[PDB]
Design a binder for these strands. Structure first.
Ligand SMILES: [K+]
Ligand SMILES: [K+]
Ligand SMILES: [K+]
Ligand SMILES: [K+]
Ligand SMILES: [K+]
Ligand SMILES: [K+]
Ligand SMILES: [K+]
Ligand SMILES: [Mg+2]
Ligand SMILES: [Mg+2]
Ligand SMILES: [Mg+2]
Ligand SMILES: [Mg+2]
Ligand SMILES: [Mg+2]
Ligand SMILES: [Mg+2]
Ligand SMILES: [Mg+2]
Ligand SMILES: [Mg+2]
Ligand SMILES: [Mg+2]
Ligand SMILES: [Mg+2]
Lengths: 83, 141, 217, 183
RNA sequence: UUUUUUUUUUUU
RNA sequence: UCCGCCGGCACCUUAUGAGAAAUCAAAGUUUUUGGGUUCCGGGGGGAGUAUGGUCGCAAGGCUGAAACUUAAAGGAAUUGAC
RNA sequence: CUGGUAAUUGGAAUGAGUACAAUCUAAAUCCCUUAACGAGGAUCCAUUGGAGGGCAAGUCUGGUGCCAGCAGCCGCGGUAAUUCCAGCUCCAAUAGCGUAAUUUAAGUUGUUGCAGUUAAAAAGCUCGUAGUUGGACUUUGGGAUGUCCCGUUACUUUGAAGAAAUUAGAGUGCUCAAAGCAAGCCUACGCUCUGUAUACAUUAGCAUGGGAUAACAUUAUAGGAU
């Protein structure tokens, strides 16, 4: 949200679920954030480089977090040349 | 569920009209029974005192509530009217002329007094409040 | 003085975390009220809303305890609610103040129409429900004021909302449920996905990951 | 038909919805004492006027900016607020009308102005001076404290020319004392 | 599987 | 015996749902309120009574008030006592 | 220096009243104006309801003792009554306030917008005419540039017309205000052509553009179109 002038007005921008697109609220203590490390040509972890995924409590309580994260990681690894 | 047809306005109107009668307030003011009641739809009514009566207070209270039996002049109906304030029954006599008002709950008993829906406002053309405070004096005749 | 027992408390005492928005972003639980006192303590105000006695029947009579309802807020988008039951009124009030501090949440404020100046009302239509009590907030134009009962009005005032229309259904004379429904309605402000939030989220390191080395000792 | 029946009249205030709000009572008493009002009815009348003006402004602000009705009525309302000193030239938007408080209207009372320019030692002194025909706005004597002074007329406030404080002919008490002292 | 009825009014 | 599809009587687990809860996979998709449609309730009594009509051999059925009276009656669940 | 109190002191101010006079008026009266009078306990003396909670205000003092009484509701009163009868003090409004059909609050009549397992509630079950409701499908696109190419209704847009008064609203110092429709410059033997705007208005009727969503009627025994 912005003013007519163009100033940012919101207190903060909440994160969104990587799978459901839902807004992750401040009291959502079932939500998690995961970093998947990247590997070089020799299968060694490159420090500081990873793909970040966030899951809201709703999807994790449903048990669908595993498959959603698997699909998201597969797509992101295909895009990022991590194989 | 409710009817929602665009051509179903008549049914909705008729259903509301029929169901309004289940409302007690609506039925009271649309049955035309207020004219058969002692006041016949008036705020006040004059009457003649027939007899002083003591009414026992309801549980858990214990008292003798002082009331008067009054006959309304305009229709001859007989009612019970409470006489408020300490010793104000002494200002009432048989065959006296009294102005009667409602007890404040629109035709229902008030407090620990059972079956009394009226109170005395004036006696012999002088308000009971003035008599209680000695502002005025009850006419001798 | 204060000895933090949590990573968040250690970071807040070490000045690594400086704004409540940093904690709100990652949805981290806050389990020490000293965190709130350090972060937004100076601007916070408290108010006891109700002292409610409750009784438990026992073999030798009724054991009476008192329920304290406390509302805290900075009047600038932060508000918290606290409920505590104790044998003594003072202990209940202290516990309720602590719980209200621990439960402070961010409140999103938007514009009714034209977006000039600071936000004055709720961004959208939100509804809260506690027990049978349901509280609905509707955006209102500038100058409409807070059209609400005294309990919701106080809760909204502590949240910094300038004008809003409200409606309530159910047993609003249950003060606890009324205030809790108002609080739930206010919390739901930041959960509604609007077009202005359609932008892709760009994640940032969590405080436990950003300051992992410091917390490693 | 009685032609007098066609004259119309209206109320100027409303009673509070809740009679016994302690905070409302405290605030109202503070305002009444600060401005030396005789009762809560004057404050409620000022509140009624402010509410009417704010409702008109809020209604106008809902219309489209290019709506001719909005343009006309907004200009009229802004001119009205500027004439009576409620709004300053910089405050040239209907939005600033919504930011008007009862204190703004109270500050335009002839009593408050008479106290402020220094013609009275206190707000109550200003009240008694006004109701005793010692004050004039232009060439017209005014004895109504609720008189709302316009910006143009503010600088013309002065003592009545027929009063002891504005001209000659001292009061009856002074004349009686002078006559008594003559012996 | 014998038999076992009752406890003035208000208040704590 | 095994794997499936349709239809049916049910059951078990679960909440991301609802609910005042008890509970409910329909009692969900409801203040973010609108798929179509019938019936039907409006504090507790008086009362399913009076009166009129209608059906019935009868018993009674259907339709169905008012005067008056009253601050609770009532639902779910908690602790204790029994 | 800054504030609050005092039937302590001190002089100032003034209208309620009173009254020459003028003014007003058909004539009077009132208002406005104004000679002479008119305030210290400024006796020129403010009242109506309340003080347990809802709901602002006393665990003050005396009396009564489930009596008398209060109390819209919950409740007070049984010999230590914040609740009755009184004194004091305090609170709300204030020249007003109390008491005895109708609106809101009432999403407790629910079209917007309520309910029907156990709170009041779905007919024992099925059929069924009125009523209400009713699946999909018929011309889209580009080129260009509002314009060119390949039966009856509902509904919506626009316009006319649609008494005033009342409502909203523009202007205007009746001393202010409720009002009213006035009025303003300058004292010119006058002027502002002075103003006395504007908006709103269910349904139904009249005229007009649109042809999505809908309703009624029709289709093939060709007795059809040309
Ligand atoms: K009794
Ligand atoms: K009693
Ligand atoms: K008793
Ligand atoms: K009270
Ligand atoms: K005694
Ligand atoms: K005593
Ligand atoms: K009381
Ligand atoms: Mg026996
Ligand atoms: Mg009933
Ligand atoms: Mg109080
Ligand atoms: Mg006593
Ligand atoms: Mg007393
Ligand atoms: Mg209901
Ligand atoms: Mg039952
Ligand atoms: Mg039932
Ligand atoms: Mg049944
Ligand atoms: Mg039938």
């Amino acid at each position: 949200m912005q003013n007519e002038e163009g100033q940012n007005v919101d207190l903060y921008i909440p994160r969104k679920c990587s799978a459901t697109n839902r807004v992750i609220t401040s009291k959502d203590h079932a939500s998690v954030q995961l970093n998947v490390g990247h590997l070089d040509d020799k299968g060694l972890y490159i420090p500081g480089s990873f793909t970040t995924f966030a899951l809201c409590g709703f999807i994790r309580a449903q048990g669908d977090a595993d498959s959603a994260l698997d699909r998201l990681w597969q797509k992101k690894k295909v895009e990022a040349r991590q194989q | 569920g409710k009817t929602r047809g665009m051509g179903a306005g008549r049914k909705l109107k008729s259903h509301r009209r029929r169901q309004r009668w289940a409302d007690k307030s609506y039925k009271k003011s649309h049955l035309g029974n207020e004219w058969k009641k002692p006041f016949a739809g008036s705020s006040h009514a004059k009457g003649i005192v027939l007899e002083k009566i003591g009414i026992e207070a309801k549980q858990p209270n214990s008292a003798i509530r002082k009331c008067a039996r009054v006959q309304l002049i305009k229709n001859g109906k007989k009612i019970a009217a409470f006489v408020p304030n300490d010793g104000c029954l002494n200002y009432i006599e048989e065959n006296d002329e009294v102005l009667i008002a409602g007890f404040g709950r629109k035709g229902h008993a008030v407090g620990d007094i059972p079956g009394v829906r009226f109170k005395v406002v004036k006696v012999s053309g002088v308000s009971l409040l003035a008599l209680f405070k000695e502002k005025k004096e009850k006419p001798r005749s | 003085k204060w000895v933090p027992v949590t990573k968040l408390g250690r970071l807040v005492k070490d000045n690594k975390i400086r704004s409540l928005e940093q904690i709100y972003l990652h949805s981290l639980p806050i389990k020490e009220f000293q965190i709130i006192d350090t972060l937004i303590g100076p601007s916070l105000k408290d108010e006891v809303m109700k002292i409610m006695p409750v009784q438990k029947q026992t073999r030798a009579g009724q054991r009476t305890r008192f329920k304290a309802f406390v509302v805290v807020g900075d009047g600038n988008g932060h508000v918290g609610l606290g409920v505590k039951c104790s044998k003594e009124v003072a202990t209940a009030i202290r516990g309720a103040i602590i719980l209200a501090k621990l439960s402070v949440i961010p409140v999103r404020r938007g514009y009714w129409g034209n977006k000039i100046g600071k936000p004055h009302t709720v961004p959208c239509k939100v509804t809260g429900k506690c027990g049978s009590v349901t509280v609905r907030m509707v955006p209102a134009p500038r100058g409409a004021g807070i059209v609400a009962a005294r309990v919701p009005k106080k809760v909204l005032q502590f949240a910094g909302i300038e004008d809003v229309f409200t409606s309530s259904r159910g047993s609003t004379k249950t003060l606890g449920n009324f205030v809790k429904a108002t609080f739930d309605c206010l919390m739901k402000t930041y959960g509604f996905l609007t077009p202005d939030f359609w932008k892709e989220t760009r994640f940032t390191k969590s405080p436990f990951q950003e300051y992992a080395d410091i917390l490693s000792k | 038909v009685h032609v007098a029946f066609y004259r119309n009249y209206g109320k100027t205030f409303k009673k509070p919805r809740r009679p016994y709000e302690k905070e409302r009572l405290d605030a109202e008493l503070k305002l009444v004492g600060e401005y030396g009002l005789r009762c809560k009815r004057e404050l409620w009348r000022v509140q009624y006027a402010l509410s009417r003006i704010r409702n008109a402004a809020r209604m106008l602000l809902t219309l489209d900016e290019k709506d001719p009705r909005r343009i006309f009525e907004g200009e009229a309302l802004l001119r009205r607020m500027n004439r009576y000193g409620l709004l300053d030239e910089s405050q040239n938007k209907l939005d600033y009308v919504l930011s008007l408080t009862v204190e703004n209207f109270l500050e335009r009372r002839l009593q408050t102005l008479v106290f402020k320019t220094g013609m009275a030692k206190s707000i109550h002194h200003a009240r008694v001076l006004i109701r005793q025909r010692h004050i004039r706005v232009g060439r017209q004597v005014v004895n109504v404290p609720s008189f709302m002074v316009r910006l143009d007329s503010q600088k013309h406030i002065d003592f009545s020319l027929i009063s002891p404080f504005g001209g000659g002919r001292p009061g009856r008490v002074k004349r009686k004392n002078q006559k008594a002292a003559a012996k």
